[PDB]
Design a protein around this nucleic acid. Sequence first.
DNA 1: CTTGACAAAAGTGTTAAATTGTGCTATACT
DNA 2: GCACAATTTAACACTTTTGTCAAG
Lengths: 1112, 86, 93, 105, 157, 39, 263, 115
Amino acid sequence: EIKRFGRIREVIPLPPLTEIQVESYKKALQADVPPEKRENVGIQAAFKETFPIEEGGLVLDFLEYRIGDPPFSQDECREKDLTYQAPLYARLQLIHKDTGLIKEDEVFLGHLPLMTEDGSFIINGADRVIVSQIHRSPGVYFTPDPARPGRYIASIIPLPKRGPWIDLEVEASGVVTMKVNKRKFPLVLLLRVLGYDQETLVRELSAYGDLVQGLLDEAVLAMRPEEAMVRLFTLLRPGDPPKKDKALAYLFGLLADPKRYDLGEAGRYKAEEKLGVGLSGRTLVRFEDGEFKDEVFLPTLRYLFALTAGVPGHEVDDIDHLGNRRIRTVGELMADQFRVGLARLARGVRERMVMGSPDTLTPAKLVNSRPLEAALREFFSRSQLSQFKDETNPLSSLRHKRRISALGPGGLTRERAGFDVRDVHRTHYGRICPVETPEGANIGLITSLAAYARVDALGFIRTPYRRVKNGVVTEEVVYMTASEEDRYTIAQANTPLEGDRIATDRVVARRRGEPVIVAPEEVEFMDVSPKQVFSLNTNLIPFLEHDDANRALMGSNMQTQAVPLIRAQAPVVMTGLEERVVRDSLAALYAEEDGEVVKVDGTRIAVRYEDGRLVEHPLRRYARSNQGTAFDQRPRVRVGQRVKKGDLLADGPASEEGFLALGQNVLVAIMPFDGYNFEDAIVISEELLKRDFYTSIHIERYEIEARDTKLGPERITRDIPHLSEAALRDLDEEGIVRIGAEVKPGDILVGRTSFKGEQEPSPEERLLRSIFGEKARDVKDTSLRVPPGEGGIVVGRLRLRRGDPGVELKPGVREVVRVFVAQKRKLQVGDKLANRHGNKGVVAKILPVEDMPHLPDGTPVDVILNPLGVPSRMNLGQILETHLGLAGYFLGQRYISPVFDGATEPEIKELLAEAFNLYFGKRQGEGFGVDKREKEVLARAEKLGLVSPGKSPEEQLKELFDLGKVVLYDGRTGEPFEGPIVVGQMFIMKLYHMVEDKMHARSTGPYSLITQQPLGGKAQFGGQRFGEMEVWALEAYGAAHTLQEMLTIKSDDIEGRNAAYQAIIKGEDVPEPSVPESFRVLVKELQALALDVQTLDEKDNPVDIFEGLASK
Amino acid sequence: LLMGVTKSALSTKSWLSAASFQNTTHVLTEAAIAGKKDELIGLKENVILGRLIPAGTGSDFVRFTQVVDQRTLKAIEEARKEAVEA
Amino acid sequence: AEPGIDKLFGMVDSKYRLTVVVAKRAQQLLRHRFKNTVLEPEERPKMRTLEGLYDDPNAVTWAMKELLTGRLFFGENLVPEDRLQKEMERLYP
Amino acid sequence: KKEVRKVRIALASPEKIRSWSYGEVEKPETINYRTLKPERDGLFDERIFGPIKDYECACGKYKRQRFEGKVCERCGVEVTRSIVRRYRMGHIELATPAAHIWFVK
Amino acid sequence: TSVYIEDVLHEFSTIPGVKEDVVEIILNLKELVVRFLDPKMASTTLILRAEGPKEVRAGDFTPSADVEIMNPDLHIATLEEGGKLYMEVRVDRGVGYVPAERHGIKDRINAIPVDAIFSPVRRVAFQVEDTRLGQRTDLDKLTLRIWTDGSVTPLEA
Amino acid sequence: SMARPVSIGEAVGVVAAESIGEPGTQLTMTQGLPRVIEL
Amino acid sequence: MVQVDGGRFATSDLNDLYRRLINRNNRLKKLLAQGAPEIIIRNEKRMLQEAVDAVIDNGRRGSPVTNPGSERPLRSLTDILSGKQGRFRQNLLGKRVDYSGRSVIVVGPQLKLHQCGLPKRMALELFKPFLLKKMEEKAFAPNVKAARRMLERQRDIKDEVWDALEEVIHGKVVLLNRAPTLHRLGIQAFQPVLVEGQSIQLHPLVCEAFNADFDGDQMAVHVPLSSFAQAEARIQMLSAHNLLSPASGEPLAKPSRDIILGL
Amino acid sequence: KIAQEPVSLETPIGDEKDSFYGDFIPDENLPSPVEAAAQSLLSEELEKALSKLSEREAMVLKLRKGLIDGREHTLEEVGAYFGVTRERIRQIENKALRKLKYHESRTRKLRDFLE
DNA sequence: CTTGACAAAAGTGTTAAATTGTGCTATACT
DNA sequence: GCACAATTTAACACTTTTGTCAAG
Ligand SMILES: [Mg+2]
Ligand SMILES: [Zn+2]
């Protein structure tokens, strides 16, 4: 069954949540678009900007660019460790400046990575993703002076690395000094070549007041542009001789140059309608015939001098406002790095033509690859806006794509963000998620996009709304921009709508994000749905209005930390968005047209569509991902049936029948249990392990290379000198582990053979070698044995030796072997578990179904959660979720409660009265009545007034059952618990963190080469660190030796650790260590500084800490 | 002259104390110049040297204790009289 | 908890002096394999096991029970550091 | 063999540093692009800092502890432990005296 | 306990002509009840074969002596057009709950263990009411209700 | 910790340092931690 | 300078510094010989005074020298000492150690204030030097070497060890530390009671002193080898003993949450 | 292959600012505690296993394996040491090793160290 | 325990091949 | 970038030492 709630019906569905990465990239592609009629922006803006190349003399020019079909498919590029890219050819033309001879000759550029279907590229054969960036929009802005109280400082900024910053700060003088790139020069100076002398510096200046005279100088006002041009040029550039034309050609590129100053279209546009003038181009000025014709600097003062005065219409700007901030998308930065990388090619063009043979030349010799190729390869890897894709689950990538980072190269950093770039701005609303953000020190720094929010070309974010005329909801769907919002007066979706009309005379609305009571007349707009007010994950939280942001945060992020499940199940209570989730995430299979299933075959599902053509949709079963989480697609259809286009043919890794399914629904007991649920801990029932609940699959990657050393080349084989038939078992033939065989922690996956560097065996060892006379083979075992804790089966063999077709290997490498390892992990003791309400916890000791708090129907609960972190963390969501689950158990009907619009107390109360009326009736019918124990509980509960006195047990237990609570019998004792205990069906999730992978320890491991300190981390096979904090703690205890143990024998000491493993292994007490050896190195390092460090004893006497070493 | 805890941490006796604190470059200079020898009086000024902490059980008060059982105690109780007769 | 701690702490003036005593004495106990000490066969700190119940090899505990009786003598500059290690290595192999 | 209770710090002098060094590193090279052995005067040169392998001279005429400390008459390397390369410093003789940026800035 | 199929390398493998993977087949193999007509047996080996377009089930097995399926309607796998599937299992009898990870098989090349749910008892619920059958009052009438599958009768339980 | 006169050879400085060092994470809600630093 | 897997090499920045120094100091020595003009000398000699200083404090003068193509500043002598991760704070006043490890934490209701669940596996590799000798004494393998290979290879961990390890465990107690380490009580000494599973059990009361809860928090464990140190671990560093707050003077491990509610 | 230059040990690894590439390199140029204890067990067990041999062959044995002065002495030298021929010493070794063979095939103390 | 006879292994000497270290060119160009 | 002297290396003809076998 299915049931939904809320009276708010969305008019416009959720636009594809995956287009923000795909569409914005698509525009900058123009792959389908013809070479003649294109859009000029995006990637073709990189060619037309860096062209024509002009400089005895030459003129190149851009014409077109072709999109090379991908050299290899997705899969191939993945298993080859090769970037999923494709050739970009380009046709330009090399023309002589004098000869008038034309030479065209198309050339090559390089390989530009293409985006996949989901929206994530493949770099170096790895699945990565480009996260969105955010920074203030270009233009003019005015704010109060950080120094002076009584004024406002204007400013101009184009784009990061597309031009310099501009600020006008009036120093406390009474005169004015503009500042750019760290320097202060008279604002009046700048007007030199700008075309403004004395009489011009007054005409609009006196239109204000006291501010005229600080803008009139004399000492430099006498001269004219070509003089004072070199004047400020000698100052701002004291690196080269103060020449004349060098002050023209220099400053020409600081403003007038449209190619050296790229002011984003948003800047030109917005700053235009801001100041009250208009610009021709994207530039601050114009190189017009010698001198410089003004464009921006004149209108930037007609505002900056107006506001400071106090005239209406001119005012300060909101720095943190969203209409003043844009979003750098994929098709943006990709193009930026493409052009700035292409200019590095343009210079590699201007150095080749100026020499050699200026007669015989073609662009075929004048271009280059690397200045561009490397420029792109750099961005797609090292930049902060490109990291490892989140494949932890389907919803994971879908979130990771819609994430907006304020960090990155041209963003901000953890230093300069106090509050401003963190805090939630009034305008955020239906654009940025007010809650979802990392719980660490990055809170507010990186948020996500709103489910209905959109980003236009300019970069601003527009949120959906609905026009209304006098209590009439219009079908008009307006995407209002950030600034557009502050104008109109918007209502809410929870407003009193009676049949497309307003009901109450006092309706909820606001202005600039300011809630106020409003009339049915003055309502200009309305909200489409409360869903837009939040993000995706946040919208998957039912009864979210009953909880707190703090917990909602985790409640969302953990869903990303979630893992698939073999038996996975969608919640019996959702918000109803899961449907669009499984589709828009493109993790499942649907019907493109109206077909009929020809064959099931959990490998290939053939469907011959009504169009008559036979089309099959091959499936990917059990395939590794980034976090190790399997990718499975379960076929749902018969051997044949006809379906309609859009119908699901196969599930996803996390999907159930087209419903996002994270964890599972179990029977939760809210009650203290012998302090095992202590402090947000979790207990569970063994009965879950039977049905294979919360049991997933994981895969791991293992590879090895055949290196060719100085001595000689190595190789993969089944031959090992000292090996025994046992270890050589699972290796089939060529000396690799077979498919489907066990691998214990320390089993040989793939054997390798190498020639050890020849070194005479030690004398004792030569004798031992002389007893058994074992031949000392040149070659020694180089093999690769799976690390500890990692074990399972083997579902893959991929070996690529070099010199093979379609595979390029690193120089000096013969072959490489890659094995996959599958693991079926069952929910263990201590593994992370959480719900949708942000309640974390680990598994503390499961428990035999035998002794469990069951019910009169002999149904034992599955968890027993602690009723403590509810009143503190204040999340009542899990309470109502479980409350509905309690009835939904007996009715089996799946509920859908939309965010901030859903089932209320009366509704659920009704469902409980219903569920009880049939449940208790099943007891009456089955030949029973009210249990004595139940009578006991009803009584002692009646004494406290939990059930209205004077009513029969049927009605008392009816009021209780509907309250969310019932009678529980302890499987151990058999007696009923004192008070009633709430229970029901709740959705829980087995998170990423697994004890199996997070547990570790060592005794004697490897040591750092520099200092003999033990290695850290896990994989390095090393021990933990003893912080200064720990050292201090031990000092506070007073443990002298225990501290020294941490500082000598167990860390960097040389002879000490050896005398430890020596003594202990024989029983003697550990000797007294000496030199920490980190200190010896410290001393020698100081010696390198010509610092004489001398150790003394008890009387001012030399002490040699280096035994016979440095003595000379 | 009262000063901040930091100032007092850098103005301390041993050089090794402030050396591991901060502004190291400025410490070593002023140290080596006057050629100051640390007495390892402070604990952290010792931890650096990888030695036994002047406090706790390693204290210069309680680390000088000795333990003897009755039988052996009397066995050495005779040892002192074996030098007066020999 | 370590039984006797209230009494142990109540013996020495300091805190750590107790540690120095327990430590050095336990050292003497593991050096000679318990054939030095002041405990009778019923005082011996036995360790129960599925196999057999022997005397607990842990020297720390042995030293505990040792000092708890008071049969031991401790102090600064008690006896010359020479003979103290000379006759201790003699009486027992 | 003796207690350590005190640690001094002084200014090292050129004539002192000359005493520290086991040789002047001349050739600013690391190692041969083929043999991977320390260059004749290279900053890693065994002939001054020490053997790369325990109790083996470079050329390999003295291969055992039987001859300890005896300097090789062929390669010029002192046969000893390979650990000595962590405590044996070098020096570079400057044609023109220079100051230490520390005291300067 | 034990399971094997002609073409399988592991519990995740996919056999042509089958709708589900091996693990979904095991998901129904754990729900498979088979009684022993003899108290003296310590083990057995069930055999199964299916060709053509047919839905395999616990009743499709190869009947033998001392064996009876109590749920012939238990859906195992759906064989599509021409789908050929051979299968065999060893259903041993035991006590308690031992996951496959604790018991080996070593039957042959690919011998895949499975979890063991012995406990033929599904659920048990007892109720204590007020009995009318004795001298005094406030006495109890114990009523114990037993729910088990096919392997053993409630009375026997 | 022992509700008895402090033992000789005690590290009490480090003790104090920790004693006031722990609460330093709860002073958000007065002049708070900045005052403590200011003092 | 050493090579790693794959064959590629590696080197310190101070090497290239110590090199680019000698180059100039050499060329100069050739010029002061062959009779070259004062301009070239004064300039060449300038790059000597700056290079030398670059090997000392790199960056206190001008833009720091970096390997060509990269923006990564070369680390000089002074760069190693000063700083958070410098040879003082990271390799002297704290360091990675031997005989240690860590894992997730789980509640201890059946455990006394002196007890903790220590993972079966984790304890074996923690006490390996001990258990080796315990296997020496207690038959099964002739000697030390035997025990080693008899353990490392093959999870043959049969009762021969699972018990003997308990024999070396009894008495001495290990230490558990929860980060951050604020209160010294954030490191306490507990009895190593071998338990099934990878998790770690801890007493619910003192769990407050560690500022810990079981939401998936993780703790580290070490073993105090020296009997002298072991004494310290049980006498002062023991949890059972320190029940009071060294800060407030008021008790530390006391009823909490559930307990309070019951009582 | 020879073209490409070394790699800066200061190259930060991972997405953090606190990580380096240097520390991720182990140390093979120095004996591990387990290796010291290993070579100790061999140097010991071989000593006691040596004691069970003829006085002349016990010496001649460690003269041919370089266990005495660290250097190996050829038959020509051993024969000049005792006064026998270079033929006698040769046979002496044959019967020597093969004589310890019997005790080793039993005690199994040194059956280890087989890598 | 010891000879004499031999083949394999380790020397010892002179070469052919290769690998590496150097000086240098000329329209003019600052 | 190249002709080429400089020096290193692998090349190889062949002498002497050292492990070794059948027979005293
Ligand atoms: Mg926690
Ligand atoms: Zn030599």
